[PDB]
Amino acid sequence: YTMCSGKFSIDKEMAETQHGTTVVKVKYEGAGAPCKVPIEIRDVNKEKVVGRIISSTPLAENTNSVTNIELEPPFGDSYIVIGVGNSALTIHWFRKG
């Protein structure tokens, strides 16, 4: 699979789980599915944080499909960008230490 080229929207706001992760649900509104949900997690220095995605490589299976994404945000501020281009969405998360 290649990365989805189209727009995503938040289907369920990012929320903390009980086992030290967060989960967010996104709806894929674009074309070219099945395709990989583009997900990048960066710290305050805009540097990528690796290995924090818990879900097996999240896919948008079809146009309008909803995908569950489980993440393990680092401590402090992280900026999670889902999608590509001008329609990419950013989620700011703060994890208290």
Next chain:
Amino acid sequence: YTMCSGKFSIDKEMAETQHGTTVVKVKYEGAGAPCKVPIEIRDVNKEKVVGRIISSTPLAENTNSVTNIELEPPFGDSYIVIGVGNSALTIHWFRKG
């Protein structure tokens, strides 16, 4: 910057340099520039190979702009995917050991 959402084409075929790298030039034909050229390098097991991009984070500055990309392919077979979606291009490279 976010990742470019649009189509790229090969402007200059991937070629070996003298100092143990390769260089390929791509033309960005899409919108939303300036944006980051999406580049992933995977091995035969389709696993990402990290730290092989020599160029500072390649950008497409504008629609129709041409970007120079210097890479350090791993030994053996690597598959370099530029772009996203159904218009993403794949380059197969073999590096003799």
